[PDB]
Structure formats: C-alpha cells, structure tokens
C-alpha cells in the first residue's frame, strides 16, 4: 500500500503494515521536534519492556469498562482511528498499568535468578 494507506482498513488488516509507519532556523526546529516525537514513543516501549517489537503482549488484563466489544467487533469491524477515539479517555490509565506490571516482572525475574 503506502504510508497510512491502511488507515481506513480494519484493525486486523492494518497490522500487516506496521513497519510502513514505524519508519519515517525553522528547519532546525523541525529536526529537533521530529526527534522528540520519535523518542516519546520509544521511551514508553523501553519502559514497557516492548522495545524492539512491533507487537508486544503484556500481562495486563483487559478491563471491560474500557470497552465491552468482542474481538470480532474490534479487529474485523474497526479502523484504528475509530478505536483510538473509543478509548481516548482510558489510554493513559492503560499505559500506567503496563508500566506497573513490567516493573513487577523485572523484580520477579531478579528474585528467580537470586534463588537460582
């Protein structure tokens, strides 16, 4: 397809293109801003333990209050644009829960190695 060519496609269909968007005085300001933009999201992935991955499963259970939709209703019946709007009020909450879960995992793996 092309850059954002999948934006109107279903969330499941769009997943094949993740790499397409993963890549990519005023001129200096534009360059610095692009770096800050990139690092903002990479910083979250590093904290979540998801660095280096396009798709990263976590240990955080889905809370049905965020959405009551079935997997077919989400993956085969939605665009990512629509999905972001549905959970726009819960996105930061989810992010914090992922971070808490990762830190506990890092601690538990350390303790396992201490025992072994």
């Amino acid at each position: 397809l092309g850059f954002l060519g999948a934006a109107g496609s279903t969330m499941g269909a769009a997943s094949i293109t993740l790499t397409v968007q993963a890549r990519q005085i005023k001129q200096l300001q534009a360059r610095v801003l692009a770096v800050e933009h990139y690092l903002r999201d990479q910083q979250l992935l590093g904290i979540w333990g998801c660095s280096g991955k396009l798709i990263c499963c976590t240990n955080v259970p889905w809370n049905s209050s965020w959405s009551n939709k079935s997997l077919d209703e989400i993956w085969n019946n939605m665009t990512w644009l629509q999905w972001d709007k549905e959970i726009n009020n819960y996105t930061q909450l989810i992010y914090r829960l992922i971070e808490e879960s990762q830190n506990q995992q890092e601690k538990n793996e350390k303790e396992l190695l201490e025992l072994d």
Partner: nanobody
Amino acid sequence: GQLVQSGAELKKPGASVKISCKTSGYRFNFYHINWIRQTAGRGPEWMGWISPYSGDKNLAPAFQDRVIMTTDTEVPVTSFTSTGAAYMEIRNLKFDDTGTYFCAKGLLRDGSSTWLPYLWGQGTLLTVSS
C-alpha cells in the same frame, strides 16, 4: 444504524418492480447490502447481495436472469457515518414472487461472516394480481 424500504406496491403479472433501500447511521460503503425474499409457500430465500464499494454482486442462481442490483454513491454525514441507497429491480413478476421483500446489511467489515444480514429493514409487501 437504520434501513428504510420503499412502501408496498401492487403489480400486474409480467410487470417490473423497483425497490429502494435508504440507509443511515453507518458508512454505506463499509458493508455488503443483502436482499432477502420471504414467501409463505417457499420460506425465506436468498436473492444475493451487492457490494456498495466495489460494485461486485452475487446473485443466487434462481435470480440471476431476473434480478438487477445497483447502488447510489454515498453522501457522508460524519467522518464515520454516511447516507445512501441500494436498489433492486425484479423483471417478469409472477404470482410466486409475492410476499415480503427485505433489505439487510453485512455484519462485519472483514472475516468469514462479513456479508451476513445483521441489520434488517422493516420489509415491505409485493402483491401481484390479474
């Protein structure tokens, strides 16, 4: 999401009839438009379906020589909803073609069940008399 159909109409045998199906509250192009017939002597019958997006259509073998399907270009209301209409024409009506005709839309945008008639219009009667 709602579908609205043309009201009931009386025809003579051999006459053609055209039935509209106005749509609102969802993107017209996102889902297949199905047509289903119900007659007391036959039960429910599939009349086939037409995609509003590609224009592709799949008529059941019984209706391939008598039924023509077409759609209007959608007119957007919101970034995620639109209005538009589907039409079906039936040629050479017979007394066996009487009964309720229904408009329906596909369940999903993708997956094996995408075209299933999830949402139905109220349906309207077709009558044939000498």
